[PDB]
């Protein structure tokens, strides 16, 4: 799983209230949890099995005739044109996102909250309670510092260390 020591290929670590994950640079897309690559714009015979989005690949569709479609990888479902774990299909979190939980005997979806929010036991553990989260990211010394932006922690460049 993604930890503070995890290296993200062409990406960077970010932190929410309950997990860490890699976020891609520029306009790249995730092919797995720790690797970002360039997306293809059109699915066809030349781009089969290449990424076309976060956890999505171009799939050869056998038929009369053969066609090509961009579909989510195994274990993911497309919800509002975004691939998410199947166990997160009907999870509503509010000020957060649903992630896969593997601590119970069966796979479950749990809410991981934006920085500043925590699961609310009085609201089905949704992200509707204010709480503090300490940044655990290990940023570059003298050049970077951990800051919260758009609800996540990430290593930001200090003033003058551009």
């Amino acid at each position: 799983k993604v930890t503070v020591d995890t290296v993200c290929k062409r990406g960077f670590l970010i932190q929410m209230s309950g997990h860490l994950e890699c976020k891609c640079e520029n306009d790249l897309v995730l092919v797995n949890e720790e690797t970002c690559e360039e997306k293809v714009l059109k699915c066809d015979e030349k781009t089969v099995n290449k990424p076309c989005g976060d956890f999505s690949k171009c799939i050869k569709i056998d038929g009369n005739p053969v066609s090509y479609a961009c579909k989510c990888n195994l274990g993911y479902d497309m919800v509002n044109n975004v691939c998410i774990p199947n166990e997160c299909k009907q999870v509503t979190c509010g000020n957060g996102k649903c992630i896969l939980d593997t601590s119970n005997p069966v796979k479950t979806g749990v809410c991981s909250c934006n920085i500043g929010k925590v699961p609310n036991v009085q609201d089905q553990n949704k992200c509707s309670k204010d709480g503090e989260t300490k940044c655990s990211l290990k940023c570059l010394k003298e050049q970077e510092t951990c800051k919260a932006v758009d609800g996540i922690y990430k290593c930001d460049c200090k003033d003058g260390f551009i």
Partner: single-chain antibody
Amino acid sequence: QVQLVESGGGVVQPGRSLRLSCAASGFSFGSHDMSWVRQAPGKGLDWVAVIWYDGSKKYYADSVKGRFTISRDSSKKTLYLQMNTLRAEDTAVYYCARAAYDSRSLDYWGHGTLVTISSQPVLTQPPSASASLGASLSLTCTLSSAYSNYSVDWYQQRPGKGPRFVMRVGTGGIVRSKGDGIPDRFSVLASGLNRYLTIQNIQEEDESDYHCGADHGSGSNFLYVFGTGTKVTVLG
């Protein structure tokens, strides 16, 4: 695992409406095209409508054009079929069918719900076939020369049950995709315009109606066609 359960069937008078549902469980609902297929008493399969995995396209059969509407509420993982201006011609068992992740084959079928309304050729199969226990039988499905390179799907419908997917066979006799729970006694072959489903060491449980089907996606229009069905009788 994969499950499709239909609901909403019943008796309706000609001219009125009826909405069918299909609750899906066991798979990524957004990664599969979903279809409705109907079967009138004593007849073969008849494709009704299809909706795209992401929801970009909806296609319908000419017999239901302007009267039926397919929908999916991606959240609830439910497939709908709205039927207006019903006719006695619409009396049939309606199955919701799921397409495979990487092919047009209908690899999973519901058990069906009954609706009773009361107050160029692509594919061809012989109507019947027979064989003795333990023998071998080859079922034939013949294409038109204009579609000589088409792949066809085979489906098995046990008596009193709904269909299930067996195998898709293309030119060269290549297994393009195979259904779940199919015994090794089942195989496929091809020769020119013909596609074959073969069964060795025939059992009493092989007594079924076998249906040939194929998708046809020319231009920006989609259509799934079915043969008449070959009813197989096992002697002994």
